[PDB]
Design an enzyme around this catalytic site. Sequence first.
Site, PDB file in Angstrom:
ATOM      1  CG  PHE A 137      -1.810   1.223   1.247  1.00  0.00           C
ATOM      2  CD1 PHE A 137      -2.817   1.391   0.308  1.00  0.00           C
ATOM      3  CD2 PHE A 137      -1.568   2.252   2.184  1.00  0.00           C
ATOM      4  CE1 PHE A 137      -3.595   2.534   0.321  1.00  0.00           C
ATOM      5  CE2 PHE A 137      -2.373   3.387   2.219  1.00  0.00           C
ATOM      6  CZ  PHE A 137      -3.355   3.536   1.283  1.00  0.00           C
ATOM      7  CG  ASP A 179      -0.527   6.067 -18.629  1.00  0.00           C
ATOM      8  OD1 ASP A 179      -0.727   7.270 -18.924  1.00  0.00           O
ATOM      9  OD2 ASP A 179      -1.448   5.280 -18.317  1.00  0.00           O
ATOM     10  CB  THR A 219      -0.915  -0.525 -17.820  1.00  0.00           C
ATOM     11  OG1 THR A 219      -1.550  -0.962 -16.599  1.00  0.00           O
ATOM     12  CG2 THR A 219      -1.770  -0.920 -19.027  1.00  0.00           C
TER      13      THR A 219
HETATM   14  O1  LIG Z   1      -2.325   0.165 -11.428  1.00  0.00           O
HETATM   15  C1  LIG Z   1      -2.472   0.680 -10.316  1.00  0.00           C
HETATM   16  N1  LIG Z   1      -3.427   1.586 -10.070  1.00  0.00           N
HETATM   17  C2  LIG Z   1      -4.100   2.385 -11.082  1.00  0.00           C
HETATM   18  C3  LIG Z   1      -4.339   3.788 -10.597  1.00  0.00           C
HETATM   19  O2  LIG Z   1      -5.036   3.744  -9.357  1.00  0.00           O
HETATM   20  C4  LIG Z   1      -4.339   4.293  -8.244  1.00  0.00           C
HETATM   21  C5  LIG Z   1      -5.250   4.104  -7.077  1.00  0.00           C
HETATM   22  N2  LIG Z   1      -4.661   4.340  -5.768  1.00  0.00           N
HETATM   23  C6  LIG Z   1      -3.714   3.619  -5.096  1.00  0.00           C
HETATM   24  C7  LIG Z   1      -3.388   3.976  -3.784  1.00  0.00           C
HETATM   25  C8  LIG Z   1      -2.498   3.219  -3.075  1.00  0.00           C
HETATM   26  N3  LIG Z   1      -1.905   2.163  -3.725  1.00  0.00           N
HETATM   27  N4  LIG Z   1      -0.901   1.407  -3.236  1.00  0.00           N
HETATM   28  C9  LIG Z   1      -0.546   0.670  -4.282  1.00  0.00           C
HETATM   29  C10 LIG Z   1      -1.296   0.922  -5.436  1.00  0.00           C
HETATM   30  C11 LIG Z   1      -2.211   1.901  -5.049  1.00  0.00           C
HETATM   31  N5  LIG Z   1      -3.132   2.597  -5.738  1.00  0.00           N
HETATM   32  C12 LIG Z   1      -1.051   0.370  -6.795  1.00  0.00           C
HETATM   33  C13 LIG Z   1       0.011  -0.509  -7.025  1.00  0.00           C
HETATM   34  C14 LIG Z   1       0.232  -1.021  -8.293  1.00  0.00           C
HETATM   35  C15 LIG Z   1      -0.599  -0.669  -9.341  1.00  0.00           C
HETATM   36  C16 LIG Z   1      -1.640   0.234  -9.145  1.00  0.00           C
HETATM   37  C17 LIG Z   1      -1.870   0.738  -7.864  1.00  0.00           C
END
Ligand SMILES: O=C1NCCOCCNc2ccn3ncc(c3n2)-c2cccc1c2
Length: 328
Positions: A137, A179, A219
């Site tokens: 996280f 991205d 991605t």
């Molecule tokens: O592809 C990912 N999200 C797309 C974008 O969303 C971010 C949302 N908030 C968050 C907020 C906290 N976390 N902690 C890890 C991730 C995340 N995400 C994370 C890790 C790997 C990939 C992605 C997110």
Amino acid sequence: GPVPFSHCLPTEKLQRCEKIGEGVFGEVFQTIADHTPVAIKIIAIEGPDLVNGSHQKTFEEILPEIIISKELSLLSGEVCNRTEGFIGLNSVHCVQGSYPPLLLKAWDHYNSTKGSANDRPDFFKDDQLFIVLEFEFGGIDLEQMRTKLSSLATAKSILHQLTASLAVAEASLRFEHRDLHWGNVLLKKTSLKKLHYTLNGKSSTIPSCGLQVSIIDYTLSRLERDGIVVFCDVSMDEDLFTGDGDYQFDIYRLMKKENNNRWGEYHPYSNVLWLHYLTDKMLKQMTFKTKCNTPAMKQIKRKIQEFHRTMLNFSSATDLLCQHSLFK
Ligand SMILES: O=C1NCCOCCNc2ccn3ncc(c3n2)-c2cccc1c2
Ligand code: NA
């Protein structure tokens, strides 16, 4: 082969899921695993239904993102090229099932409160396959923190962390994120005053301003190891280059211009472009709690403006980190 959803997401773990983000790929939830916050990214694979406007990837087509996520995770424990500025990857699983109702509940709550661009993930059958990636996280994305930062000194720190993390990955992996919109930059509080990185054997520090930055969502990312390239081929994508209404959507076009639509190649200028885009967001679309009405703070603002003005003349994040006056 695949395991049921419950093997990854037992009841308590499901019950604690909050949706935190999304994309064409699918859905991202926050939850608790073994008293520890984690983020779960869930991607449908191998089916023929349309999902959020695209076809589902095959297992083979998700492999690059797995590989990249693992490589970037491993940078936190390397020596010559070390950074924590990406995100930990804890596990990857292939699950089979219809979408859990409790996930639909959390999906719904997010749709009520923030709005979703996705289809409600309620059409999947009990034979449907997904990849479930469990990440450390990382905090809260920069876009959602746009009114919460202390000052332009915090903005400085963030840019520096981003640049260093990208530099380290350039040097170790010839990495491009491709991205890095502000939804992909996470912020998390830290009581460390300095963060540490190492670039080509040379160690350095960055003042944290109370925050630790994590770059996420691989991605579209590209890297290579021993002449083997792992990347997302978007050469025949149309929609990706026809967005407008934000400088974000120009970055995709400027990347395509830079690489002549050859996405296998290494063009670390792409990292420069995203960093330019993020600096642009720092000067234009953020509201800081302390305005820069002191001399010292006003000087930081001028340096960032100078950065904005000149960074597009540098050829990589490494170039920027090592040579740009903002980091001296
Ligand atoms: O592809 C990912 N999200 C797309 C974008 O969303 C971010 C949302 N908030 C968050 C907020 C906290 N976390 N902690 C890890 C991730 C995340 N995400 C994370 C890790 C790997 C990939 C992605 C997110
Ligand atoms: Na991190």
